[PDB]
DNA sequence: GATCTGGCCTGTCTTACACAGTGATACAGCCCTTAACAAAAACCCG
């Protein structure tokens, strides 16, 4: 959920107010996204769909 | 003295005889955050 969000808000995110340094950003953006699933959940589908698909 | 040579002189052609090591520059991994979803040899009583 969390990991797929974050690879799909990376654009916005990652260029409107990054934070420190990477790790904290993304560290406190997958924090947000798994505190969202429910509003995640088609990121981790075309996550799983790529991994079939492999 | 003509016509011969072998003696000598050139006159090419063959194989050897060092380019690897130096400072600076440039990229490619390779650890560092969460994070969740899947994955995983190992094994007990089943």
Same mark, same amino acid.
């Given at each position: 959920?969390?990991? &797929?969000?974050?690879?799909? $808000?990376? /654009? %916005? @995110? %990652?260029?409107?107010? /990054? *934070?420190l340094? @990477? *790790?904290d950003?993304? !560290? !406190? &953006?997958?924090?947000?996204?798994?505190?969202?699933?429910?509003? !995640?959940? /088609? $990121?981790?589908? #075309?996550?799983? #769909? &790529? !991994?079939? %698909? $492999?």
């Amino acid at each position: 959920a969390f990991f &797929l969000f974050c690879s799909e $808000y990376r /654009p %916005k @995110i %990652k260029g409107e107010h /990054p *934070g420190l340094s @990477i *790790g904290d950003v993304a !560290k !406190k &953006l997958g924090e947000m996204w798994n505190n969202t699933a429910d509003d !995640k959940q /088609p $990121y981790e589908k #075309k996550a799983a #769909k &790529l !991994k079939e %698909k $492999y």
